[PDB]
Each structure stands twice: as C-alpha cells, then as structure tokens.
Amino acid sequence: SVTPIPLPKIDEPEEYNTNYILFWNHVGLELNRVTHTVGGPLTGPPLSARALGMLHLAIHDAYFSICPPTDFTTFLSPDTENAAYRLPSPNGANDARQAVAGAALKMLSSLYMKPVEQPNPNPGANISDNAYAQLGLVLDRSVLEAPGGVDRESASFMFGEDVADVFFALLNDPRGASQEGYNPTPGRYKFDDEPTHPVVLIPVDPNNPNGPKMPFRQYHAPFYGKTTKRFATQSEHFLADPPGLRSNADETAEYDDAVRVAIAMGGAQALNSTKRSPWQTAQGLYWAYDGSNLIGTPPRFYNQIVRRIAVTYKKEEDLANSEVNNADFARLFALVDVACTDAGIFSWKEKWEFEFWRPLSGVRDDGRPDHGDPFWLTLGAPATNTNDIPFKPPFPAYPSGHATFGGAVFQMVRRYYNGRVGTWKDDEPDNIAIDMMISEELNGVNRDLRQPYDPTAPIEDQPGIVRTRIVRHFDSAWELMFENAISRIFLGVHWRFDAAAARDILIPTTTKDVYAVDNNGATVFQNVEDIRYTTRGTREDEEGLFPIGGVPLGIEIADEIFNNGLKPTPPEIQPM
Numbered sequence: 001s002v003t004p005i006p007l008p009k010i011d012e013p014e015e016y017n018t019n020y021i022l023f024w025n026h027v028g029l030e031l032n033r034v035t036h037t038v039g040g041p042l043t044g045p046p047l048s049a050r051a052l053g054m055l056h057l058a059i060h061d062a063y064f065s066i067c068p069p070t071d072f073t074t075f076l077s078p079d080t081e082n083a084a085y086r087l088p089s090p091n092g093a094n095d096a097r098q099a100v101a102g103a104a105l106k107m108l109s110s111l112y113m114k115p116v117e118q119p120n121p122n123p124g125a126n127i128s129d130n131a132y133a134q135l136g137l138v139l140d141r142s143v144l145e146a147p148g149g150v151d152r153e154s155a156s157f158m159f160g161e162d163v164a165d166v167f168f169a170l171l172n173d174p175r176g177a178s179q180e181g182y183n184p185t186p187g188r189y190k191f192d193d194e195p196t197h198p199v200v201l202i203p204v205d206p207n208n209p210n211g212p213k214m215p216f217r218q219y220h221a222p223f224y225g226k227t228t229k230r231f232a233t234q235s236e237h238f239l240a241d242p243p244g245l246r247s248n249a250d251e252t253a254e255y256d257d258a259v260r261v262a263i264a265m266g267g268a269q270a271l272n273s274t275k276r277s278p279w280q281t282a283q284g285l286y287w288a289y290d291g292s293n294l295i296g297t298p299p300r301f302y303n304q305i306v307r308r309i310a311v312t313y314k315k316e317e318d319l320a321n322s323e324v325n326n327a328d329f330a331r332l333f334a335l336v337d338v339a340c341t342d343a344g345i346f347s348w349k350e351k352w353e354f355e356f357w358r359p360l361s362g363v364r365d366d367g368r369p370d371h372g373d374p375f376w377l378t379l380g381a382p383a384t385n386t387n388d389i390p391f392k393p394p395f396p397a398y399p400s401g402h403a404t405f406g407g408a409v410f411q412m413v414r415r416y417y418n419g420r421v422g423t424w425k426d427d428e429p430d431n432i433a434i435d436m437m438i439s440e441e442l443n444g445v446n447r448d449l450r451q452p453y454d455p456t457a458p459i460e461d462q463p464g465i466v467r468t469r470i471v472r473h474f475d476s477a478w479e480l481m482f483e484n485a486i487s488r489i490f491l492g493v494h495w496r497f498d499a500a501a502a503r504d505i506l507i508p509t510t511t512k513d514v515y516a517v518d519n520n521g522a523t524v525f526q527n528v529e530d531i532r533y534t535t536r537g538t539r540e541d542e543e544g545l546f547p548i549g550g551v552p553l554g555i556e557i558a559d560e561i562f563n564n565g566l567k568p569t570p571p572e573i574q575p576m
C-alpha cells in the first residue's frame with residue numbers, strides 16, 4: 001500500500017541486535033527517526049524522550065518480574081492497592097524473552113498506532129495515514145527480526161502486554177504537546193517566533209498534502225512541563241533566574257558578554273564576526289539531531305551512545321544468551337531513559353516559565369547600535385536531509401534541552417558505572433571512554449539537499465552536499481556531557497547560561513563576568529578535567545540558590561532518581 005521509506009545504515013556492530021533488550025531499544029529508536037520523517041506522533045524532544053522512558057519501564061518490570069533482581073525492585077509492585085500502580089503478576093509465565101517482546105510490542109503499538117479509540121481530537125490531529133502506515137511497517141517488520149522470534153500465544157508474551165497496558169494507561173500523555181491557547185508576549189528578553197521561520201504553511205488537511213495550505217506559528221509543548229505526570233523524580237526542580245530577568249536583571253555585564261560570545265561562537269560560516277573554528281563547527285553539528293528526516297531527536301543519539309557504552313562495558317561476552325547482560329541493559333536503559341524523560345519535563349517547564357529569547361532574536365532585537373546586530377545569522381539548528389535553511393527550535397532558550405538531556409543521561413551512566421569502569425568521586429570526572437562513535441549528522445552519508453527530500457528513495461541517490469564522516473573517541477561521560485552542552489553555543493541556538501554558569505565552563509579574566517578570548521577572538525573553554533558545575537544563582541519567586549543552565553539540572557535529576565532507586569514520583573506531588 002505504501003512505499004517503505006528507505007532508511008540509511010546505522011553505524012553500529014550488527015552484533016548489538018542479537019541481544020533482545022538492545023533489539024527493542026533499537027526498534028524504539030527506529031520509530032523515533034521514522035516519526036520525524038513522516039510527521040507522526042511523539043515528535044519533538046520532550047515527548048520523544050517520554051516514549052523511550054515508557055518503553056524501557058515496561059521492558060524493565062516485565063523482565064524483572066520474571067527474573068527478580070537482588071538489589072532493587074520493579075518500578076511498580078504487584079501488591080500495591082492502587083490499581084493504576086499495580087503491576088500484573090506472571091502466575092507461571094516464565095519466558096523473559098517473550099515477556100519483554102510482548103511489553104515492547106504493546107507499548108510501541110499503543111504509542112505509535114492510529115488512535116482508533118476515538119480520543120484523538122486535537123491531541124496530535126495533523127498526522128496523515130501514510131505517517132501511520134510507515135510506522136506500522138517498522139512495527140510489523142520488528143516482530144520478524146526479533147532475535148529468538150515472537151510467540152504471541154505465549155503466556156509470557158501476554159503477561160508482557162499486560163505490563164505495557166498498565167504503564168501506558170498511567171504515563172501516556174495524549175495531549176501533552178498541545179500548543180492550544182499559547183501566544184507569545186513580545187518585549188525585551190521575550191521568546192517569539194524566530195525571524196528566519198516566522199510562519200509556516202501547512203496543508204489544511206494532512207491527508208491532502210498538495211491541496212490547500214494554511215499559516216502556522218509553532219510553539220512546542222508550552223503546557224507540558226507544567227502539567228504532565230513526572231516519572232521517577234521525587235521533587236520539583238528549579239533553575240536560577242537567567243541574566244536579565246527578575247532577580248538577575250542586574251547581571252548586565254554577564255548578559256552583554258553572553259551577546260558578544262553568542263555572535264563570535266555561533267554565527268553563520270561566512271560572517272566576518274564568526275570566530276568559531278572548523279573543529280568547533282564539527283562539535284556543534286555532531287550533537288544536533290534536531291528532529292530531522294531519517295535522524296530524529298537528541299534522545300535517539302543519546303541512546304545510540306549508551307548502547308555503545310553498554311556493549312563496551314558488559315560483564316559477559318555473549319550478547320545473545322546472557323541473563324547477566326540482559327539484566328544489565330534492562331536496568332541501565334530504564335535508568336537512563338527515565339532520567340531523560342524527566343530531564344525533558346523539567347527543562348520544558350523552565351523554558352516556558354521564563355520564556356527567554358533565542359540568541360538570533362536577542363542579537364537582532366538588542367536595540368543598542370554598538371551591541372546588537374539587526375542582521376546577524378546563526379549557524380543554526382541543521383535541517384538535515386532537506387533543502388531547507390538552518391533554524392531556531394520553536395521554543396524558549398533557557399535552559400537548553402540538549403544540556404539537560406545530556407546532564408541527566410550522562411550523570412546516570414556515571415552513577416551506574418562508577419566502580420565498574422573506574423573509580424571517581426560522584427561529581428568529578430569519570431573514566432567511561434568510548435571510540436568509533438559516529439554521529440548521523442556527520443557520517444559521510446546524510447546531507448544538505450539541493451531539492452526536497454524524496455521519501456521513496458535512499459538518501460545516497462539524492463543530490464546534495466554530503467556531511468563529512470567523523471569518527472570520534474571520547475575519554476569520558478564528563479566530556480560527552482560537556483561537549484553536548486557547548487554544541488548549542490557553536491550552533492548559535494543557545495546562550496552560554498542555557499548550558500551552565502559561564503563561570504563553570506569559561507576561562508575568567510580580571511574583569512567580572514567577562515571571559516577569555518584568544519587572538520582571533522574566539523572563546524576559551526576550561527579543560528573538561530577541571531569543570532565543576534558548582535556556580536548557583538537566585539530566583540525572584542523562591543528562596544535560596546539554584547543551579548544555572550541545563551547541565552546542572554540534568555545532573556541533579558539523575559542523582560535524585562538513582563539515589564531513590566528508580567521509584568515512582570509520589571502521586572501526592574504530581575501536577576494537579
């Protein structure tokens with residue numbers, strides 16, 4: 001019925017998918033990239049993370065229900081009185097492979113299928129039937145490629161689907177990304193539609209693309225972080241007021257230097273004012289994954305990296321028949337993906353709370369003849385595998401979602417591997433190194449097209465400029481976390497403070513809030529080995545010191561989840 005979209009090859013050993021836990025993570029990642037290529041459900045950063053958090057939670061409890069863990073316990077218990085939180089019981093079901101399969105297939109089906117359950121109005125109603133059909137191909141195919149096969153008649157398989165139903169019913173946020181009712185309030189430091197993509201024309205009817213179109217101003221998930229059910233966090237998380245706002249409105253020198261730096265480090269390639277280096281351009285594009293065709297969102301890359309870390313540091317050589325390895329991955333991916341989910345909730349909550357402007361607009365609309373540049377252009381979020389120009393993600397700047405996701409994800413890996421891969425203090429540089437890590441943004445295959453993307457053809461048969469293939473080696477998760485955060489500065493899409501306190505990542509000078517520059521005028525960063533996310537700030541509405549930027553927020557979120565052992569967010573503290 002549909003022409004299957006030809007997906008490019010993934011840079012990763014085929015041996016990885018011989019382990020059924022990695023297999024299902026993989027299918028989750030394939031659905032992630034395909035929904036961003038066809039415009040289906042669970043698009044965007046916060047919600048694409050949630051989909052992975054829900055998949056792994058279900059896989060987690062189904063597996064540990066059949067092979068009970070020694071230290072921790074299942075996220076939900078079978079003995080809980082509260083129905084919503086009551087885990088189904090196996091009752092003789094004892095096939096862990098089939099329970100995971102049923103749980104992964106059910107969750108992924110429930111998440112990505114055409115909502116025939118009637119309740120689909122306005123939730124995400126703008127998805128064509130092709131989008132749905134393309135995602136169905138991925139689902140059907142996955143049943144066929146699953147290592148060990150899939151037995152739908154199996155009691156263990158049925159038990160798994162039962163597990164998924166509970167998690168879906170409890171944690172699904174059908175209308176989470178609703179933009180309905182939100183409109184920007186222009187003014188200094190205020191988020192508004194970005195000048196290079198002020199409005200978009202979208203077909204009136206998704207199932208009628210070449211028919212009429214209508215103007216559209218997109219605001220990504222403005223009510224989500226403030227209303228959605230948290231996963232495993234045990235408290236609300238907050239950041240300090242960004243420079244220029246509220247209690248930090250007097251941080252004039254900090255703000256102004258942030259403008260200077262923004263221009264020199266994140267401008268477009270050919271601008272005279274751009275002092276960023278070719279290598280720094282690489283670090284910026286490496287971590288993008290900005291909802292592009294055949295690429296998806298950041299959570300997809302974070303997982304690609306985590307899969308690599310898991311195989312490199314596994315306890316047993318056998319990827320196919322090792323319960324030790326199965327247990328390790330089910331636990332790790334649940335921890336990392338639940339942390340990613342919550343990182344997404346809180347970074348989005350803060351974004352829309354402060355509604356801080358993007359550097360493109362903060363620079364153009366500065367208003368001061370000697371400080372602003374009313375015609376500046378950023379390197380921008382790359383629109384890979386399209387023929388479109390770079391863009392500014394459709395949501396406020398503070399804090400950076402990438403920085404939060406990275407802080408959460410990599411702080412989780414560190415807490416998990418400390419003592420296994422090396423030894424270090426909780427908040428100090430780790431030993432978790434990896435090599436041969438390739439980003440899909442720079443793999444010698446993906447490209448910037450010269451004509452609109454053709455979904456019926458392989459990317460290699462489509463004219464455009466190919467992204468240089470860069471194979472990377474990283475010394476630690478600290479470096480991964482750090483580079484992922486500063487990547488948004490090189491792209492010009494985030495202010496330094498959206499990442500972390502300037503004081504924690506930049507080299508100071510004798511002038512306050514003004515950091516070091518080299519001869520060509522480029523910003524000098526602290527060595528990764530020396531970076532400590534310790535600089536806090538104040539809030540107008542709350543007492544005390546709070547972290548600055550996304551990195552500390554994510555770290556804080558991962559520590560809390562881990563220290564509590566992956567346990568539900570108490571309902572008493574859920575948004576109401």
Ligand code: VO4
Pocket residue numbers: 381393396397399400401402403488493494
């Ligand atoms: O979420 V960003 O918030 O890093 O372009």
